[PDB]
């Protein structure tokens, strides 16, 4: 039942909520990602949806977060990308605005994440080689 | 060569065996999951097989098991579902009968696992953020 406590909301219904409050509803959006001419159209749509999901999972796989919605990384955040306080982002901003503001710097962060994972992978393998 | 020790059996060969003995052949079942009108039909069959496998993998991914044939979850069992003994299930019941008995309570366990995973993920993130 609805009350003063938590709220269920709906699929893509926490968009207006702040980042800190919308970060607890990641599973609902992730779990909903899955006459010959008409057959071609529906098959094309299904294949595109599967390709999109596979690409997202591949990107997560390249990084060290292949099996978790929330994870942590070793590369810090350079101030030049956002130069704003931490509290003002999670408690005073939404995902749509944060996404629009970082849209021009997403590729650089992606490359940094991939390079960091590759370096950590070889460092860990070299360290474990002693055994 | 067959003997008094272990047995190989075949795909879906442990369907009539108990759960305890059938749990050793989890790999054989998992490794076997993977004229214009006829082309459409064949592509439909292949696409459906891929969607089913992706859905199963997605369900496993939402839970705390990225990828492994056997994994553990941090939620206690409720007798209300079965209430049956521990040893009496594994050593005296097959997978089909057990599935038929728990069929009316699968959605509840599926929701509880997701809830526990979300809580565990947020708790782990908060715990790791005190460095």
């Amino acid at each position: 039942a609805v009350g003063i406590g938590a709220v269920f909301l709906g699929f893509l219904g926490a968009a207006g909520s702040t980042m800190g409050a919308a970060s607890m509803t990641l599973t609902v959006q992730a779990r909903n990602l899955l006459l010959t001419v008409w057959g071609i159209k529906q098959l094309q749509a299904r294949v595109l949806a599967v390709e999109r999901y596979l690409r997202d999972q591949q990107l997560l796989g390249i990084w060290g977060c292949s099996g978790k919605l929330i994870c942590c990384t070793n590369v810090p955040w350079n101030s030049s990308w956002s130069n704003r306080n931490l509290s003002e982002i999670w408690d005073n901003m939404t995902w749509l605005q944060w996404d629009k503001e970082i849209s021009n710097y997403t590729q650089i962060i992606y490359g940094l994440l991939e390079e960091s994972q590759n370096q950590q992978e070889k460092n860990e393998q070299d360290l474990l080689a002693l055994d | 060569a067959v003997g008094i020790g272990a047995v190989f059996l075949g795909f879906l060969g442990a369907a009539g065996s108990t759960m305890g003995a059938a749990s050793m052949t989890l790999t054989v079942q998992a490794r076997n999951l993977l004229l214009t009108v006829w082309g459409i039909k064949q592509l439909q069959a292949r696409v459906l097989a891929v969607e089913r496998y992706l859905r199963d993998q997605q369900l496993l991914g939402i839970w705390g098991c990225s990828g492994k044939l056997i994994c553990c979850t941090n939620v206690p069992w409720n007798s209300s579902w079965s209430n049956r003994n521990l040893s009496e299930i594994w050593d005296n019941m097959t997978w089909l009968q057990w599935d038929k008995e728990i069929s009316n309570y699968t959605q509840i366990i599926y929701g509880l696992l997701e809830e526990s995973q979300n809580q565990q993920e947020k708790n782990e993130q908060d715990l790791l953020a005190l460095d």
Partner: antibody, heavy 125, light 112 residues
Framework: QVQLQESGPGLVKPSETLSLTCGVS??????????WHWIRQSPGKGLEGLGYIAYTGGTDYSPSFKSRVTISRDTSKNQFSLKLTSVTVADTAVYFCARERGDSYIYSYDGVDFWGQGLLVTVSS | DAVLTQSPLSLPITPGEPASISCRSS???????????LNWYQQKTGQRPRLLIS???KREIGVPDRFSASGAGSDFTLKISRVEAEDVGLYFCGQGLHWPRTFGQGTRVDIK
């Protein structure tokens, strides 16, 4: 399984404070997504919800009884109590204590899982 | 205030034929998130009520399969596929969406 049991006096004079207490066993009052209500079954007029207490300690009272009902909790012994001032003859009813379902962030759950046993309170000298 | 109204007031029946009960609401119970919040309750003579069906159509655990319900928006109905002699008592329909919580007046079922 969870068990609910109310405690208090079954006879109260008119025009003063009235207090009832409902214990909880088998589960903790600090559960992640559950609420605790106080419902009374009056004869003929039907059920009435006095109020409830959330897991966070926040109280909520109905508009017709906001000026007369008060709910408190004591997490150290796993129980909660209700205080009702300015009682009248019309308040004579069977008071119940129950636990419903909270809507979690991920899924939605509704329905009252368990009910108490009910205690009749007579407002008369 | 969202009040609930049940009909018929009384349901005198005999063991051997089905039964049906109806419950309506003054306001729409379809919450903005797309989920209904109506539940059905059964209460015996001098006993605590029991939750039979939840979320409109969800047979609570440990309840007989003989009970069923359906509905959407503002019309709901409770139907019994197979009624026995121990189904004598009151039936209550309540909503857990609007504040304060409300319950129906209570329709009693008794043998004819």
């Amino acid at each position: 399984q969870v068990q609910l049991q109310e405690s208090g006096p079954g006879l109260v004079k008119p025009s003063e404070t009235l207090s009832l207490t409902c214990g909880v066993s088998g589960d903790s009052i600090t559960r992640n997504y559950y609420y605790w209500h106080w419902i009374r079954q009056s004869p003929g007029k039907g059920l009435e919800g006095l109020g409830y207490i959330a897991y966070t300690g926040g109280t909520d009272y109905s508009p017709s009884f906001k000026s007369r009902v008060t709910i408190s909790r004591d997490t150290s012994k796993n129980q909660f109590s209700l205080k009702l001032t300015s009682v009248t003859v019309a308040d004579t009813a069977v008071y119940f204590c129950a636990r419903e379902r909270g809507d979690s962030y991920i899924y939605s759950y509704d329905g009252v899982d368990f009910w108490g046993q009910g205690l009749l309170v007579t407002v008369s000298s | 205030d969202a009040v609930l109204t049940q009909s018929p007031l009384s349901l005198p029946i005999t063991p051997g034929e089905p039964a049906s009960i109806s419950c309506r609401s003054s306001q729409s119970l379809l919450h903005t998130n797309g989920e209904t919040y109506l539940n059905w309750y059964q209460q015996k003579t001098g006993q605590r009520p029991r939750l039979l069906i939840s979320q409109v159509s969800k047979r609570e655990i440990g309840v007989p399969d003989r009970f069923s319900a359906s509905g959407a928006g503002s019309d709901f109905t409770l139907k019994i596929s197979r009624v026995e002699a121990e189904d004598v008592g009151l039936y209550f329909c309540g909503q857990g969406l609007h504040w304060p919580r409300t319950f129906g007046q209570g329709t009693r079922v008794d043998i004819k």
